[PDB]
């Protein structure tokens, strides 16, 4: 299984399969040099699997810790003291935090070097695609960054077999977000597969759902690349997610999910949609999600918050929302 971009020119591949880590050599030795940027923890996890392969490993901080200015500068400089060249490659081995970061590096190093994505998490089935590199600020989630099409995406599904539930739940939220953006057909289909923590935690049939969630996006991104129209949809529930996250430091997905319900709550308070909140709540409980726990966003336009609201499957929209509505929802949600 392989997917590829559809843009007019400068298109990259997305090898999605078990053992795709093999596809990596086929490029590597066609570069002057190559820097391996890898998660501190992830490096532990698979340090050996890479020995099997003009290559300098660069171990970076674990997760979100790596996405800071401080860390961007330090790295670059290091990578610079190697009299590098435009034909050099940056290889992101890890979660979206590793890619988002490394990529930014690869996007700026000498105005643009080669970028290779070796996503290792479930959530990375979204982060590895689109080329939305960038880092964090003291003002929020990724305010500094860029769009930089990766040279290619190597998604070796074997990486996943070692993900704590905490990270499985995190990532799935995206696989699920994508299902949601495919109308009912995919939503209630996926719901009927991963209907409980047991089945989920087992990773059984995740191959199927990830592959689609990606393709789903693959179409949106290949279309509205610079997020001018539809790419704005992918920000489903992040309006509230991105917030609750950077403000509760829970795993990305956890906040997304939450925000994803919030969105619905607000859909009802606006278009009086027939959203069965209680249904989505039991879904998160049955799935095993925790369940005990905004003015600066990217879709925002000077006037107030802009949310990606679903009025019904196959009918997503974006628009302002008075803090008024944002209350009853973030209060109706408090009744849980
Ligand atoms: N389009 C985009 O650029 C985009 C899309 C989605 C989300 N994101 C970004 O993605 C990040 C969230 O993704 P994430 O969950 O992958 O982040 P992450 O890098 O923090 O990974 C989660 C944790 O799991 C560890 N880990 C990674 N691979 C593992 C594996 N295979 N087995 C076990 N442990 C592993 C990491 O060390 C980390 O502690 C955020 O920084 C978010 O802003 C960006
Ligand atoms: O266009 C995308 O790929 C996203 O909207 C990009 C966002 C990141 P942003 O809102 O910081 O651009 C990501 O969290 C979301 O899951 C998908
Ligand atoms: Zn996200």
């Amino acid at each position: 299984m392989k997917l590829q971009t559809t843009y007019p020119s400068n298109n990259y591949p997305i090898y999605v399969e078990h053992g795709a880590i093999k596809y990596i050599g086929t490029y590597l030795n066609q570069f002057d040099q190559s820097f391996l940027l890898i998660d501190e923890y992830v490096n532990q996890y698979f340090a050996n699997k890479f020995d099997d392969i003009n290559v300098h490993k660069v171990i970076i901080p674990a997760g979100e810790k790596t996405k800071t200015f401080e860390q961007y500068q330090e790295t670059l400089e290091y990578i610079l003291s190697h009299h590098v060249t435009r034909n050099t490659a940056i290889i992101a081995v890890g979660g979206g935090a590793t890619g988002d970061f490394a990529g930014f590096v690869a996007a700026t190093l000498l105005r643009g070097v080669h970028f290779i994505q070796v996503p290792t998490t479930i959530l990375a089935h979204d982060s590895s695609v689109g080329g939305k590199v960038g880092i964090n600020s003291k003002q929020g989630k990724n305010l500094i960054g860029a769009f930089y099409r990766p040279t290619a995406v190597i998604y070796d599904l074997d990486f996943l077999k070692t993900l704590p539930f905490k990270q499985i739940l995190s990532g799935y939220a995206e696989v699920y977000k994508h299902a949601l953006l495919n109308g009912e057909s995919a939503t209630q289909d996926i719901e009927q597969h991963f209907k409980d923590r047991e089945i989920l935690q087992s990773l059984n049939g995740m191959d199927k759902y990830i592959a689609k969630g990606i393709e789903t996006k693959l179409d949106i991104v290949v279309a509205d690349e610079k997020e001018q129209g539809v790419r704005k949809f992918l920000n489903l529930g992040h309006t509230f997610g991105h917030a609750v996250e950077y403000y509760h430091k829970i795993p990305h997905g956890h906040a997304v999910m939450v925000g994803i319900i919030y969105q619905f709550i607000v859909a009802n308070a606006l278009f009086d949609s027939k959203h069965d909140i209680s249904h989505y709540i039991q879904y998160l409980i049955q799935l095993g999600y925790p369940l005990d726990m905004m003015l600066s966003d990217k879709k925002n336009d000077k006037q107030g918050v802009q949310m990606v609201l679903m009025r019904q499957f196959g009918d997503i929209v974006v628009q302002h929302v008075d803090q008024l509505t944002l209350q009853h929802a973030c209060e109706q949600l408090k009744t849980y």
Side-chain angles (χ1 to χ4, degrees):
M1 162 87 271
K2 289 95 165 190
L3 294 165
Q4 192 180 299
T5 55
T6 311
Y7 296 99
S9 177
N10 297 161
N11 288 305
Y12 61 95
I14 301 179
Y15 302 105
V16 200
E17 64 178 63
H18 286 273
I21 188 181
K22 64 174 183 181
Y23 291 115
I24 299 182
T26 67
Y27 291 102
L28 254 185
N29 304 295
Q30 96 194 202
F31 294 129
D32 306 300
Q33 314 184 60
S34 291
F35 294 89
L36 197 202
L37 287 73
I38 177 173
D39 212 300
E40 177 192 3
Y41 293 168
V42 179
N43 170 69
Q44 292 284 286
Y45 279 118
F46 323 81
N48 309 332
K49 202 172 181 182
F50 297 115
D51 260 283
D52 307 359
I53 80 168
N54 57 247
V55 183
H56 309 275
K57 172 158 67 179
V58 182
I59 297 183
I60 58 174
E64 212 72 13
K65 249 195 200 66
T66 197
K67 298 170 67 176
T68 68
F69 300 83
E70 298 78 15
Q71 194 54 72
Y72 175 62
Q73 176 161 188
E74 185 183 304
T75 292
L76 274 156
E77 295 287 33
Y78 178 103
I79 306 181
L80 285 170
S81 58
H82 295 46
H83 314 285
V84 298
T85 44
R86 291 208 70 197
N87 187 71
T88 287
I90 295 289
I91 307 181
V93 168
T98 306
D100 284 12
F101 167 66
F104 189 35
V105 183
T108 54
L109 189 56
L110 312 184
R111 303 212 187 71
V113 299
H114 296 299
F115 188 28
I116 277 305
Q117 284 262 50
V118 181
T120 70
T121 65
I122 290 183
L123 198 168
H125 89 293
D126 177 43
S127 63
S128 62
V129 177
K132 216 167 191 177
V133 306
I135 75 174
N136 297 307
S137 159
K138 292 183 183 57
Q139 289 291 44
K141 282 296 303 290
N142 350 301
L143 291 305
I144 294 67
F147 291 82
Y148 194 74
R149 298 185 193 175
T151 292
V153 176
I154 279 66
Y155 200 177
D156 184 358
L157 308 179
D158 292 309
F159 289 131
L160 315 179
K161 300 182 181 183
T162 88
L163 291 159
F165 205 45
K166 192 186 196 68
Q167 306 301 166
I168 300 185
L169 283 178
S170 190
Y172 180 76
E174 292 297 351
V175 173
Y176 186 69
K177 183 188 66 181
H178 289 159
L180 288 190
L181 284 318
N182 275 294
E184 274 178 342
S185 175
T187 295
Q188 315 205 243
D189 169 56
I190 197 171
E191 291 192 5
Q192 296 183 64
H193 184 74
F194 297 116
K195 58 186 132 186
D196 54 60
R197 170 170 187 158
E198 208 286 63
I199 303 178
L200 209 189
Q201 175 183 181
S202 75
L203 298 161
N204 193 301
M206 186 60 89
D207 295 2
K208 178 178 181 178
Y209 295 87
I210 279 181
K212 197 68 216 342
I214 288 177
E215 196 212 308
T216 293
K217 173 178 181 173
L218 169 78
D219 301 325
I220 305 300
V221 293
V222 172
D224 183 64
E225 186 186 14
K226 264 81 187 314
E227 184 184 358
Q228 299 298 171
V230 294
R231 181 140 185 177
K232 276 185 172 183
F233 295 154
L234 281 156
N235 280 287
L236 189 69
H238 296 57
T239 330
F240 194 85
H242 279 152
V244 182
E245 163 186 48
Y246 197 76
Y247 192 71
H248 277 208
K249 271 91 74 174
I250 349 167
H252 202 55
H254 290 46
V256 181
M257 287 302 205
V258 178
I260 287 199
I261 286 181
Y262 185 65
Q263 159 257 161
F264 283 151
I265 306 176
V266 173
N268 304 346
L270 295 193
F271 343 112
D272 177 59
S273 309
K274 306 304 175 184
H275 289 222
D276 193 330
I277 309 308
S278 304
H279 158 70
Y280 286 117
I281 297 292
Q282 183 157 301
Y283 191 18
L284 297 177
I285 300 182
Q286 296 175 170
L287 285 181
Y289 278 92
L291 307 163
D292 44 0
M293 63 290 257
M294 281 186 89
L295 204 66
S296 192
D297 198 66
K298 223 178 306 302
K299 306 164 300 175
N300 282 40
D301 74 315
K302 272 300 179 183
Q303 182 203 71
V305 272
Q306 293 296 300
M307 287 186 66
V308 183
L309 301 184
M310 175 181 253
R311 201 195 297 82
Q312 173 155 56
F313 296 91
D315 182 10
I316 292 68
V317 308
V318 188
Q319 77 162 59
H320 186 218
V321 169
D322 57 357
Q323 78 147 297
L324 172 284
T325 291
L326 297 181
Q327 212 150 61
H328 306 109
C330 182
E331 262 62 70
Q332 195 227 25
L333 197 37
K334 277 300 189 305
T335 73
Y336 289 116

